[PDB]
Each structure stands twice: as structure tokens, then as C-alpha cells.
PDB file of C-alpha atoms in Angstrom:
ATOM      1  CA  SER A   7     104.542  86.546  86.834  1.00  0.00           C
ATOM      2  CA  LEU A   8     106.461  83.671  85.611  1.00  0.00           C
ATOM      3  CA  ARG A   9     107.249  81.514  88.734  1.00  0.00           C
ATOM      4  CA  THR A  10     106.228  82.012  93.330  1.00  0.00           C
ATOM      5  CA  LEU A  11     108.762  80.307  95.202  1.00  0.00           C
ATOM      6  CA  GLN A  12     107.553  78.727  98.591  1.00  0.00           C
ATOM      7  CA  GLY A  13     108.500  77.235 101.335  1.00  0.00           C
ATOM      8  CA  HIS A  14     108.983  80.371 103.630  1.00  0.00           C
ATOM      9  CA  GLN A  15     106.888  80.024 106.688  1.00  0.00           C
ATOM     10  CA  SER A  16     106.611  83.794 106.910  1.00  0.00           C
ATOM     11  CA  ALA A  17     108.097  86.924 106.257  1.00  0.00           C
ATOM     12  CA  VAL A  18     110.685  87.326 102.748  1.00  0.00           C
ATOM     13  CA  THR A  19     112.369  90.652 104.350  1.00  0.00           C
ATOM     14  CA  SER A  20     116.392  90.205 101.796  1.00  0.00           C
ATOM     15  CA  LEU A  21     116.810  89.595  98.550  1.00  0.00           C
ATOM     16  CA  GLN A  22     118.776  89.071  96.389  1.00  0.00           C
ATOM     17  CA  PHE A  23     118.900  86.937  91.977  1.00  0.00           C
ATOM     18  CA  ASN A  24     122.750  87.830  90.566  1.00  0.00           C
ATOM     19  CA  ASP A  25     122.895  85.833  87.778  1.00  0.00           C
ATOM     20  CA  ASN A  26     121.064  82.332  87.552  1.00  0.00           C
ATOM     21  CA  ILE A  27     120.424  82.315  91.402  1.00  0.00           C
ATOM     22  CA  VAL A  28     118.352  83.515  94.172  1.00  0.00           C
ATOM     23  CA  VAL A  29     118.946  84.076  97.792  1.00  0.00           C
ATOM     24  CA  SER A  30     116.067  85.276  99.757  1.00  0.00           C
ATOM     25  CA  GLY A  31     115.835  86.150 103.565  1.00  0.00           C
ATOM     26  CA  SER A  32     112.961  85.646 106.246  1.00  0.00           C
ATOM     27  CA  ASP A  33     111.096  85.401 109.646  1.00  0.00           C
ATOM     28  CA  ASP A  34     111.370  82.109 109.402  1.00  0.00           C
ATOM     29  CA  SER A  35     114.861  82.434 110.514  1.00  0.00           C
ATOM     30  CA  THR A  36     116.396  80.887 107.461  1.00  0.00           C
ATOM     31  CA  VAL A  37     117.636  81.966 104.137  1.00  0.00           C
ATOM     32  CA  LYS A  38     116.962  79.803 100.790  1.00  0.00           C
ATOM     33  CA  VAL A  39     118.382  79.516  97.095  1.00  0.00           C
ATOM     34  CA  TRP A  40     116.181  79.581  94.827  1.00  0.00           C
ATOM     35  CA  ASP A  41     116.502  78.334  90.709  1.00  0.00           C
ATOM     36  CA  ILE A  42     115.425  81.178  89.981  1.00  0.00           C
ATOM     37  CA  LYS A  43     113.646  79.352  86.055  1.00  0.00           C
ATOM     38  CA  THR A  44     112.639  76.257  87.801  1.00  0.00           C
ATOM     39  CA  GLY A  45     110.907  77.615  90.667  1.00  0.00           C
ATOM     40  CA  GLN A  46     112.871  75.167  92.963  1.00  0.00           C
ATOM     41  CA  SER A  47     114.748  75.627  96.193  1.00  0.00           C
ATOM     42  CA  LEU A  48     118.113  74.647  96.207  1.00  0.00           C
ATOM     43  CA  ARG A  49     119.090  74.862  99.199  1.00  0.00           C
ATOM     44  CA  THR A  50     118.063  76.040 102.977  1.00  0.00           C
ATOM     45  CA  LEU A  51     120.037  77.286 104.898  1.00  0.00           C
ATOM     46  CA  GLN A  52     119.327  76.721 108.326  1.00  0.00           C
ATOM     47  CA  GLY A  53     121.065  77.959 111.500  1.00  0.00           C
ATOM     48  CA  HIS A  54     120.104  81.480 112.490  1.00  0.00           C
ATOM     49  CA  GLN A  55     117.868  81.457 115.910  1.00  0.00           C
ATOM     50  CA  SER A  56     114.754  83.880 114.284  1.00  0.00           C
ATOM     51  CA  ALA A  57     114.606  86.948 111.952  1.00  0.00           C
ATOM     52  CA  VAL A  58     117.012  87.353 109.364  1.00  0.00           C
ATOM     53  CA  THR A  59     116.653  90.289 108.561  1.00  0.00           C
ATOM     54  CA  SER A  60     119.563  91.054 105.563  1.00  0.00           C
ATOM     55  CA  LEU A  61     121.814  89.286 103.058  1.00  0.00           C
ATOM     56  CA  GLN A  62     124.859  89.869 100.727  1.00  0.00           C
ATOM     57  CA  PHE A  63     125.551  87.285  98.820  1.00  0.00           C
ATOM     58  CA  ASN A  64     128.296  86.099  95.274  1.00  0.00           C
ATOM     59  CA  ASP A  65     129.486  82.991  93.240  1.00  0.00           C
ATOM     60  CA  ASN A  66     130.187  81.309  96.513  1.00  0.00           C
ATOM     61  CA  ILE A  67     129.311  82.983 100.073  1.00  0.00           C
ATOM     62  CA  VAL A  68     126.060  83.838 101.526  1.00  0.00           C
ATOM     63  CA  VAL A  69     126.414  86.061 104.864  1.00  0.00           C
ATOM     64  CA  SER A  70     123.113  86.900 106.377  1.00  0.00           C
ATOM     65  CA  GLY A  71     122.395  88.887 109.653  1.00  0.00           C
ATOM     66  CA  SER A  72     118.991  87.900 111.911  1.00  0.00           C
ATOM     67  CA  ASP A  73     117.760  88.608 114.437  1.00  0.00           C
ATOM     68  CA  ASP A  74     119.478  86.847 117.272  1.00  0.00           C
ATOM     69  CA  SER A  75     122.215  88.714 116.845  1.00  0.00           C
ATOM     70  CA  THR A  76     125.258  87.838 114.451  1.00  0.00           C
ATOM     71  CA  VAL A  77     126.021  86.985 111.119  1.00  0.00           C
ATOM     72  CA  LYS A  78     126.097  84.104 110.054  1.00  0.00           C
ATOM     73  CA  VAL A  79     128.341  82.768 106.747  1.00  0.00           C
ATOM     74  CA  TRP A  80     127.277  80.501 104.517  1.00  0.00           C
ATOM     75  CA  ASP A  81     128.296  78.835 101.028  1.00  0.00           C
ATOM     76  CA  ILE A  82     125.398  78.511  98.701  1.00  0.00           C
ATOM     77  CA  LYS A  83     127.890  74.738  97.470  1.00  0.00           C
ATOM     78  CA  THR A  84     126.986  73.085 100.531  1.00  0.00           C
ATOM     79  CA  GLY A  85     124.727  74.615 102.235  1.00  0.00           C
ATOM     80  CA  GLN A  86     126.630  74.366 105.198  1.00  0.00           C
ATOM     81  CA  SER A  87     127.328  77.261 108.096  1.00  0.00           C
ATOM     82  CA  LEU A  88     131.349  78.163 107.627  1.00  0.00           C
ATOM     83  CA  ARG A  89     131.126  80.243 111.207  1.00  0.00           C
ATOM     84  CA  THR A  90     129.364  82.458 112.821  1.00  0.00           C
ATOM     85  CA  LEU A  91     130.615  86.097 113.662  1.00  0.00           C
ATOM     86  CA  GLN A  92     129.216  86.689 117.580  1.00  0.00           C
ATOM     87  CA  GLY A  93     129.600  89.956 119.684  1.00  0.00           C
ATOM     88  CA  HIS A  94     126.841  92.317 118.861  1.00  0.00           C
ATOM     89  CA  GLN A  95     124.270  92.503 121.408  1.00  0.00           C
ATOM     90  CA  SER A  96     121.345  92.703 118.948  1.00  0.00           C
ATOM     91  CA  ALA A  97     119.109  92.275 115.965  1.00  0.00           C
ATOM     92  CA  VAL A  98     120.932  92.872 113.419  1.00  0.00           C
ATOM     93  CA  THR A  99     120.175  95.896 110.790  1.00  0.00           C
ATOM     94  CA  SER A 100     122.219  96.036 108.333  1.00  0.00           C
ATOM     95  CA  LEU A 101     125.335  94.205 106.639  1.00  0.00           C
ATOM     96  CA  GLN A 102     127.788  94.199 103.986  1.00  0.00           C
ATOM     97  CA  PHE A 103     130.479  92.889 102.219  1.00  0.00           C
ATOM     98  CA  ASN A 104     133.103  93.068 100.785  1.00  0.00           C
ATOM     99  CA  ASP A 105     135.378  91.353  99.850  1.00  0.00           C
ATOM    100  CA  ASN A 106     137.558  90.110 102.403  1.00  0.00           C
ATOM    101  CA  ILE A 107     136.191  92.280 105.273  1.00  0.00           C
ATOM    102  CA  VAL A 108     132.045  92.266 106.901  1.00  0.00           C
ATOM    103  CA  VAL A 109     130.732  95.063 108.240  1.00  0.00           C
ATOM    104  CA  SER A 110     127.715  94.843 110.564  1.00  0.00           C
ATOM    105  CA  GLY A 111     125.507  97.393 112.177  1.00  0.00           C
ATOM    106  CA  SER A 112     122.614  97.110 115.274  1.00  0.00           C
ATOM    107  CA  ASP A 113     120.588  97.639 117.222  1.00  0.00           C
ATOM    108  CA  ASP A 114     123.307  97.411 120.249  1.00  0.00           C
ATOM    109  CA  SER A 115     123.645 101.599 118.774  1.00  0.00           C
ATOM    110  CA  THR A 116     127.590  99.904 116.996  1.00  0.00           C
ATOM    111  CA  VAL A 117     128.770  99.423 114.105  1.00  0.00           C
ATOM    112  CA  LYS A 118     131.375  96.284 113.630  1.00  0.00           C
ATOM    113  CA  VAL A 119     134.624  95.707 111.892  1.00  0.00           C
ATOM    114  CA  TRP A 120     134.695  92.062 111.081  1.00  0.00           C
ATOM    115  CA  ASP A 121     136.792  89.389 108.351  1.00  0.00           C
ATOM    116  CA  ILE A 122     135.336  86.268 106.521  1.00  0.00           C
ATOM    117  CA  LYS A 123     138.468  83.791 106.886  1.00  0.00           C
ATOM    118  CA  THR A 124     138.856  84.082 110.802  1.00  0.00           C
ATOM    119  CA  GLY A 125     135.614  85.881 112.881  1.00  0.00           C
ATOM    120  CA  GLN A 126     137.456  88.451 114.719  1.00  0.00           C
ATOM    121  CA  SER A 127     135.887  91.595 115.308  1.00  0.00           C
ATOM    122  CA  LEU A 128     138.605  93.403 113.215  1.00  0.00           C
ATOM    123  CA  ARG A 129     137.079  97.325 114.955  1.00  0.00           C
ATOM    124  CA  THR A 130     134.117  97.933 116.626  1.00  0.00           C
ATOM    125  CA  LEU A 131     132.796 101.365 115.890  1.00  0.00           C
ATOM    126  CA  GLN A 132     131.048 102.923 119.198  1.00  0.00           C
ATOM    127  CA  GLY A 133     128.777 107.098 118.362  1.00  0.00           C
ATOM    128  CA  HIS A 134     126.525 106.055 117.600  1.00  0.00           C
ATOM    129  CA  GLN A 135     123.127 106.582 119.931  1.00  0.00           C
ATOM    130  CA  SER A 136     120.620 104.230 119.142  1.00  0.00           C
ATOM    131  CA  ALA A 137     120.602 101.542 116.947  1.00  0.00           C
ATOM    132  CA  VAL A 138     122.407 101.915 113.439  1.00  0.00           C
ATOM    133  CA  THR A 139     119.700 101.293 110.681  1.00  0.00           C
ATOM    134  CA  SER A 140     122.287 101.277 107.666  1.00  0.00           C
ATOM    135  CA  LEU A 141     125.522 101.133 105.912  1.00  0.00           C
ATOM    136  CA  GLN A 142     127.653 101.543 103.113  1.00  0.00           C
ATOM    137  CA  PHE A 143     131.745 101.321 102.928  1.00  0.00           C
ATOM    138  CA  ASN A 144     134.608 101.013 100.221  1.00  0.00           C
ATOM    139  CA  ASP A 145     137.830 100.725 100.732  1.00  0.00           C
ATOM    140  CA  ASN A 146     138.854 102.966 103.194  1.00  0.00           C
ATOM    141  CA  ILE A 147     135.684 104.754 104.485  1.00  0.00           C
ATOM    142  CA  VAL A 148     131.917 103.402 106.389  1.00  0.00           C
ATOM    143  CA  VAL A 149     128.962 105.515 106.081  1.00  0.00           C
ATOM    144  CA  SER A 150     126.054 105.175 108.871  1.00  0.00           C
ATOM    145  CA  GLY A 151     122.603 105.705 109.710  1.00  0.00           C
ATOM    146  CA  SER A 152     121.711 105.295 113.164  1.00  0.00           C
ATOM    147  CA  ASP A 153     117.770 106.475 114.909  1.00  0.00           C
ATOM    148  CA  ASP A 154     119.199 109.026 116.386  1.00  0.00           C
ATOM    149  CA  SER A 155     118.855 110.949 113.854  1.00  0.00           C
ATOM    150  CA  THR A 156     122.471 111.943 112.620  1.00  0.00           C
ATOM    151  CA  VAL A 157     124.994 110.102 110.041  1.00  0.00           C
ATOM    152  CA  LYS A 158     128.590 108.748 110.678  1.00  0.00           C
ATOM    153  CA  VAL A 159     131.403 108.554 108.995  1.00  0.00           C
ATOM    154  CA  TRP A 160     133.932 106.082 110.407  1.00  0.00           C
ATOM    155  CA  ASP A 161     138.168 105.281 108.790  1.00  0.00           C
ATOM    156  CA  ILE A 162     137.151 101.377 108.622  1.00  0.00           C
ATOM    157  CA  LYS A 163     141.251 101.294 109.114  1.00  0.00           C
ATOM    158  CA  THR A 164     141.009 102.696 112.761  1.00  0.00           C
ATOM    159  CA  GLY A 165     137.547 102.698 114.086  1.00  0.00           C
ATOM    160  CA  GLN A 166     138.262 106.848 114.467  1.00  0.00           C
ATOM    161  CA  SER A 167     134.993 108.632 114.490  1.00  0.00           C
ATOM    162  CA  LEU A 168     135.863 111.773 110.819  1.00  0.00           C
ATOM    163  CA  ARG A 169     133.173 113.917 111.550  1.00  0.00           C
ATOM    164  CA  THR A 170     129.091 112.804 112.106  1.00  0.00           C
ATOM    165  CA  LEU A 171     125.911 114.121 110.223  1.00  0.00           C
ATOM    166  CA  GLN A 172     123.381 116.174 111.410  1.00  0.00           C
ATOM    167  CA  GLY A 173     121.095 118.102 110.918  1.00  0.00           C
ATOM    168  CA  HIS A 174     117.932 115.840 110.723  1.00  0.00           C
ATOM    169  CA  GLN A 175     115.195 115.948 113.078  1.00  0.00           C
ATOM    170  CA  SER A 176     115.202 111.829 112.854  1.00  0.00           C
ATOM    171  CA  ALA A 177     115.558 108.017 112.704  1.00  0.00           C
ATOM    172  CA  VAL A 178     117.428 107.347 109.694  1.00  0.00           C
ATOM    173  CA  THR A 179     116.309 105.040 107.971  1.00  0.00           C
ATOM    174  CA  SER A 180     118.125 104.958 104.537  1.00  0.00           C
ATOM    175  CA  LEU A 181     121.516 105.747 103.347  1.00  0.00           C
ATOM    176  CA  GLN A 182     124.123 105.651  99.516  1.00  0.00           C
ATOM    177  CA  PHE A 183     127.084 107.429  99.002  1.00  0.00           C
ATOM    178  CA  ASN A 184     128.646 107.905  96.120  1.00  0.00           C
ATOM    179  CA  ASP A 185     132.522 109.906  95.477  1.00  0.00           C
ATOM    180  CA  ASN A 186     132.432 113.332  98.190  1.00  0.00           C
ATOM    181  CA  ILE A 187     128.607 112.310  97.766  1.00  0.00           C
ATOM    182  CA  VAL A 188     126.145 111.452 100.938  1.00  0.00           C
ATOM    183  CA  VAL A 189     122.651 111.570 100.202  1.00  0.00           C
ATOM    184  CA  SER A 190     120.555 110.226 103.319  1.00  0.00           C
ATOM    185  CA  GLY A 191     116.447 109.786 104.361  1.00  0.00           C
ATOM    186  CA  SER A 192     115.383 110.339 107.600  1.00  0.00           C
ATOM    187  CA  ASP A 193     111.868 109.778 109.587  1.00  0.00           C
ATOM    188  CA  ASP A 194     111.623 113.561 109.302  1.00  0.00           C
ATOM    189  CA  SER A 195     110.441 113.016 106.306  1.00  0.00           C
ATOM    190  CA  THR A 196     113.162 114.547 103.982  1.00  0.00           C
ATOM    191  CA  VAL A 197     115.901 113.964 101.658  1.00  0.00           C
ATOM    192  CA  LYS A 198     119.857 115.343 102.390  1.00  0.00           C
ATOM    193  CA  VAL A 199     122.491 116.086 100.343  1.00  0.00           C
ATOM    194  CA  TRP A 200     126.058 115.722 102.448  1.00  0.00           C
ATOM    195  CA  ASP A 201     129.484 116.672 101.412  1.00  0.00           C
ATOM    196  CA  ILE A 202     131.619 114.046 103.324  1.00  0.00           C
ATOM    197  CA  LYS A 203     135.169 114.812 103.378  1.00  0.00           C
ATOM    198  CA  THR A 204     133.406 118.617 105.212  1.00  0.00           C
ATOM    199  CA  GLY A 205     130.306 117.674 106.679  1.00  0.00           C
ATOM    200  CA  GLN A 206     128.890 119.786 105.218  1.00  0.00           C
ATOM    201  CA  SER A 207     124.748 119.833 103.813  1.00  0.00           C
ATOM    202  CA  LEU A 208     125.019 120.511 100.435  1.00  0.00           C
ATOM    203  CA  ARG A 209     120.662 120.602 100.431  1.00  0.00           C
ATOM    204  CA  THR A 210     117.681 119.815 101.411  1.00  0.00           C
ATOM    205  CA  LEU A 211     115.201 118.234  99.150  1.00  0.00           C
ATOM    206  CA  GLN A 212     111.166 118.824 101.606  1.00  0.00           C
ATOM    207  CA  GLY A 213     108.582 117.136  99.399  1.00  0.00           C
ATOM    208  CA  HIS A 214     107.025 113.872 101.821  1.00  0.00           C
ATOM    209  CA  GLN A 215     104.648 113.863 103.082  1.00  0.00           C
ATOM    210  CA  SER A 216     106.314 110.944 106.048  1.00  0.00           C
ATOM    211  CA  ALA A 217     108.731 109.194 106.647  1.00  0.00           C
ATOM    212  CA  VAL A 218     110.689 108.112 103.977  1.00  0.00           C
ATOM    213  CA  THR A 219     112.285 104.707 103.453  1.00  0.00           C
ATOM    214  CA  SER A 220     114.139 104.277 100.656  1.00  0.00           C
ATOM    215  CA  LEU A 221     116.538 106.142  97.570  1.00  0.00           C
ATOM    216  CA  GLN A 222     119.132 105.960  95.070  1.00  0.00           C
ATOM    217  CA  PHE A 223     120.466 108.557  93.744  1.00  0.00           C
ATOM    218  CA  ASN A 224     123.226 108.446  90.927  1.00  0.00           C
ATOM    219  CA  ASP A 225     125.904 111.819  89.265  1.00  0.00           C
ATOM    220  CA  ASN A 226     122.665 113.928  88.605  1.00  0.00           C
ATOM    221  CA  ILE A 227     119.613 112.211  89.861  1.00  0.00           C
ATOM    222  CA  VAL A 228     117.576 110.624  93.722  1.00  0.00           C
ATOM    223  CA  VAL A 229     114.797 109.331  93.806  1.00  0.00           C
ATOM    224  CA  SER A 230     113.601 108.711  97.727  1.00  0.00           C
ATOM    225  CA  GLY A 231     110.326 106.532  98.505  1.00  0.00           C
ATOM    226  CA  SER A 232     108.511 107.462 101.302  1.00  0.00           C
ATOM    227  CA  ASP A 233     104.937 106.264 103.380  1.00  0.00           C
ATOM    228  CA  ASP A 234     103.435 109.041 102.042  1.00  0.00           C
ATOM    229  CA  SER A 235     103.064 106.309  99.779  1.00  0.00           C
ATOM    230  CA  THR A 236     104.560 108.117  96.437  1.00  0.00           C
ATOM    231  CA  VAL A 237     107.270 108.596  95.435  1.00  0.00           C
ATOM    232  CA  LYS A 238     109.457 111.307  94.067  1.00  0.00           C
ATOM    233  CA  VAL A 239     111.918 111.888  91.113  1.00  0.00           C
ATOM    234  CA  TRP A 240     114.452 115.058  91.904  1.00  0.00           C
ATOM    235  CA  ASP A 241     117.946 116.546  91.088  1.00  0.00           C
ATOM    236  CA  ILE A 242     120.988 115.961  92.912  1.00  0.00           C
ATOM    237  CA  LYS A 243     122.361 119.383  91.886  1.00  0.00           C
ATOM    238  CA  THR A 244     119.928 121.952  93.116  1.00  0.00           C
ATOM    239  CA  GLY A 245     116.711 120.642  95.548  1.00  0.00           C
ATOM    240  CA  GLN A 246     113.342 121.152  92.810  1.00  0.00           C
ATOM    241  CA  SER A 247     111.406 117.929  92.841  1.00  0.00           C
ATOM    242  CA  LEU A 248     110.943 117.181  88.963  1.00  0.00           C
ATOM    243  CA  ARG A 249     108.075 115.075  89.292  1.00  0.00           C
ATOM    244  CA  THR A 250     106.353 112.101  91.948  1.00  0.00           C
ATOM    245  CA  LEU A 251     104.727 109.570  90.636  1.00  0.00           C
ATOM    246  CA  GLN A 252     101.572 107.970  91.920  1.00  0.00           C
ATOM    247  CA  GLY A 253      99.435 105.228  92.470  1.00  0.00           C
ATOM    248  CA  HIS A 254      99.965 103.443  94.579  1.00  0.00           C
ATOM    249  CA  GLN A 255      97.333 103.236  97.949  1.00  0.00           C
ATOM    250  CA  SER A 256      99.812 102.928 101.016  1.00  0.00           C
ATOM    251  CA  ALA A 257     103.351 102.898 101.263  1.00  0.00           C
ATOM    252  CA  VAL A 258     106.240 102.222  98.982  1.00  0.00           C
ATOM    253  CA  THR A 259     108.882  99.759 101.245  1.00  0.00           C
ATOM    254  CA  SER A 260     111.551  99.394  98.542  1.00  0.00           C
ATOM    255  CA  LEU A 261     112.911 100.418  95.240  1.00  0.00           C
ATOM    256  CA  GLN A 262     115.772 100.436  92.457  1.00  0.00           C
ATOM    257  CA  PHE A 263     115.846 102.619  88.837  1.00  0.00           C
ATOM    258  CA  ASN A 264     118.277 101.370  86.137  1.00  0.00           C
ATOM    259  CA  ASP A 265     118.126 102.909  83.210  1.00  0.00           C
ATOM    260  CA  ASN A 266     115.498 105.440  82.571  1.00  0.00           C
ATOM    261  CA  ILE A 267     112.246 102.932  84.523  1.00  0.00           C
ATOM    262  CA  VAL A 268     112.459 102.812  88.469  1.00  0.00           C
ATOM    263  CA  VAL A 269     110.381  99.630  89.859  1.00  0.00           C
ATOM    264  CA  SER A 270     108.737 100.167  93.891  1.00  0.00           C
ATOM    265  CA  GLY A 271     107.193  98.263  96.254  1.00  0.00           C
ATOM    266  CA  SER A 272     104.187  98.830  98.527  1.00  0.00           C
ATOM    267  CA  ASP A 273     103.233  98.444 101.094  1.00  0.00           C
ATOM    268  CA  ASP A 274      99.336  97.581  98.465  1.00  0.00           C
ATOM    269  CA  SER A 275     101.220  94.255  97.728  1.00  0.00           C
ATOM    270  CA  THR A 276     101.599  95.624  93.906  1.00  0.00           C
ATOM    271  CA  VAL A 277     104.948  96.074  92.050  1.00  0.00           C
ATOM    272  CA  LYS A 278     104.677  99.227  89.577  1.00  0.00           C
ATOM    273  CA  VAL A 279     107.220  99.954  87.347  1.00  0.00           C
ATOM    274  CA  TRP A 280     107.410 103.706  86.003  1.00  0.00           C
ATOM    275  CA  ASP A 281     109.586 105.844  83.977  1.00  0.00           C
ATOM    276  CA  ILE A 282     111.495 108.799  84.593  1.00  0.00           C
ATOM    277  CA  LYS A 283     111.214 111.584  81.941  1.00  0.00           C
ATOM    278  CA  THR A 284     107.298 110.718  81.887  1.00  0.00           C
ATOM    279  CA  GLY A 285     106.297 109.872  85.135  1.00  0.00           C
ATOM    280  CA  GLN A 286     103.745 107.901  83.778  1.00  0.00           C
ATOM    281  CA  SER A 287     103.395 104.051  85.941  1.00  0.00           C
ATOM    282  CA  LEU A 288     103.802 101.485  82.707  1.00  0.00           C
ATOM    283  CA  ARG A 289     102.699  98.539  84.991  1.00  0.00           C
ATOM    284  CA  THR A 290     101.298  97.049  87.884  1.00  0.00           C
ATOM    285  CA  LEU A 291     102.564  93.921  89.248  1.00  0.00           C
ATOM    286  CA  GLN A 292     100.257  92.573  91.096  1.00  0.00           C
ATOM    287  CA  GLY A 293      99.582  89.004  92.809  1.00  0.00           C
ATOM    288  CA  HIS A 294     101.035  89.037  95.834  1.00  0.00           C
ATOM    289  CA  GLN A 295      98.724  88.716  98.699  1.00  0.00           C
ATOM    290  CA  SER A 296     100.378  91.012 101.554  1.00  0.00           C
ATOM    291  CA  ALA A 297     102.963  94.199 101.612  1.00  0.00           C
ATOM    292  CA  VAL A 298     106.392  94.085  99.191  1.00  0.00           C
ATOM    293  CA  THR A 299     109.301  93.987 101.636  1.00  0.00           C
ATOM    294  CA  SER A 300     111.805  93.669  98.993  1.00  0.00           C
ATOM    295  CA  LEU A 301     113.153  94.180  95.342  1.00  0.00           C
ATOM    296  CA  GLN A 302     115.619  93.727  93.007  1.00  0.00           C
ATOM    297  CA  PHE A 303     115.432  93.315  88.472  1.00  0.00           C
ATOM    298  CA  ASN A 304     117.767  93.757  86.042  1.00  0.00           C
ATOM    299  CA  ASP A 305     116.111  95.052  81.761  1.00  0.00           C
ATOM    300  CA  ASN A 306     113.546  91.939  81.477  1.00  0.00           C
ATOM    301  CA  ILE A 307     112.699  90.519  84.801  1.00  0.00           C
ATOM    302  CA  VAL A 308     111.267  91.570  88.518  1.00  0.00           C
ATOM    303  CA  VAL A 309     112.556  89.600  91.627  1.00  0.00           C
ATOM    304  CA  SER A 310     110.063  90.087  94.496  1.00  0.00           C
ATOM    305  CA  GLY A 311     110.145  89.228  98.420  1.00  0.00           C
ATOM    306  CA  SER A 312     106.703  90.280 100.164  1.00  0.00           C
ATOM    307  CA  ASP A 313     104.925  89.860 103.378  1.00  0.00           C
ATOM    308  CA  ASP A 314     103.025  86.861 102.479  1.00  0.00           C
ATOM    309  CA  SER A 315     106.394  84.707 102.253  1.00  0.00           C
ATOM    310  CA  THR A 316     106.937  84.186  99.235  1.00  0.00           C
ATOM    311  CA  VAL A 317     109.285  85.505  95.824  1.00  0.00           C
ATOM    312  CA  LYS A 318     108.084  85.491  92.825  1.00  0.00           C
ATOM    313  CA  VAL A 319     109.108  86.912  89.965  1.00  0.00           C
ATOM    314  CA  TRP A 320     107.946  89.222  87.403  1.00  0.00           C
ATOM    315  CA  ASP A 321     107.815  90.323  83.909  1.00  0.00           C
ATOM    316  CA  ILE A 322     109.322  93.507  83.159  1.00  0.00           C
ATOM    317  CA  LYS A 323     106.616  94.008  79.727  1.00  0.00           C
ATOM    318  CA  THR A 324     104.117  92.078  81.998  1.00  0.00           C
TER     319      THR A 324
END
């Protein structure tokens, strides 16, 4: 641990730290822009009426989604609000913006496509029968997961539903797609590998004994975290479990892997750093007083957000 970012009055729900800036979201309705080298708070983005649930930011803009059912576009150089995206009828759960387009998912079961010049709703994506829990999009496609246990592939340019991937027996919780493959996690404790162009289920990864909470994959591996407190390494081309990372004493809430290192966050208030091929735990980052909800690491530090309302900056080697 190198610094502790304090100031939030409630749990930290979202986090991104690109460059020398940490931007955190909180249950206290605020978004904070942090100085990651002196631990000082630069700006407090005030405006949301309840829990900030998700955020993303580039070199000039912060886009935040909240339980108050709106998306807000902020400006880091002044902290002032630029526009409020109104239209959703309940909490915003998921968020991503790509250089002209904000795509938001909601508890009202809809996905909305907006523009970050006007604030107008481009298209409303209807189809999901319950809360949209996750989404990801590129220039032409939108893939979204739902509490209705399905993943839907949308054409970003017409609102049309291109296909619906059925197979999960419970809510989809995690979702990533790259090239022609989309990988989903579910509350049924399974990971599924789908082909986006045929809607076919290529594989089902079984092993977890409770809800899959988080996942991430490259062209050959899938790493998944689950409520059973383990992290699993799978090959994506077959369905074989390669190894299981045990050590956490409660649900894994967050994970990211870059090169040969998996970093996991947990409800046991700790962050673990593992090697993927030996499966051995390299470091336990202790200091948080409650569940770790968010994390992100580069090649030298880990930035973690906790239920204890603090963000912590850890050294990858300590």
C-alpha cells in the first residue's frame, strides 16, 4: 500500500485510474477525481441523487451512471456537469462510451444509445424482460446481458435485435465479447462461450459451485471469479478447467489479468495477486476494512475500491 484515498462517505462502487488520475464512484452520490501520487482529491463531481453505480472517463470527460436512473457527462478540468441523459425509468447498471456514443443499460430492462453532444436518445433497445446487468459495444454491435438469463446482440444503428442467446438458467452477471466470440457468466454458476454470428453455444464451462461474478478472456484463456470464493482458469478452445486459484475466504467480486498475472478482489476485504501458470498466490494485499468491490492494475500498481468507502493504491511487488 502506497496511499489511501479518503473522502467518500460510503462504499466505492466503480473505479478507473488511467494515467495519473483515479476517478471513483460512490454510494454517496458523488464522483471523485483523485491525484494518485499524493493521494489528494482534485474535484468532487456532485449532481447525482443516489448511488453512482458505474463510470468511464477519457482525458477530458467523465460519464457516470447512477441509481437515480440518469447518466451524467462531466468535465474533469472543471468538475461541472455538461449534460444529464434522462430517459431511463430506474437505476443505470452498466455504461460504456465510445467517442460519440454512450450506451447505457438499466433496471428498466432497456438499453439506450445516446450522443455526448446533444444529450438526445438515439435509440431505445427493447427486448430484455428484466434488468440489463452488463453490456459492451463496438462501432456496429451491442451485446447485453440481463437478469432474464439471456444475452442479446443488437445492431447499434437501427435498434433491431439480431439474435438472443438462450442457455443460461439464471441472471447473466458478466459479459465480454471480442471478434466473433462472446463469453458470459451467470448466476447458475456456469460460463458459456457463444458465437455471435450464429447465436450458437460453442461451450459451457462448469466447475464453479455458485454464481459467476466476473470474467475476462483473451484469444486462448478465460479467467472467472465466483461467489464460491475461487478463481478459475479455463481454456476457451476446449472446456477444460486448467486450474483453480484458492485462497479467498468469500466471494470474488472483481478480477483482471494482464500477461501472466491475475489480480482478484474479494468480500474478505483482501486483494490477491496470482500467477496464471503455476496457480500460486504471489501476494495478499491487506488493509481494506470491508469487501473489495472494484480494482484495476497496470504493470506496477493496483488501485482497489472497497465497501469501507476508501480507494487504496498498492504496489504490485508489495
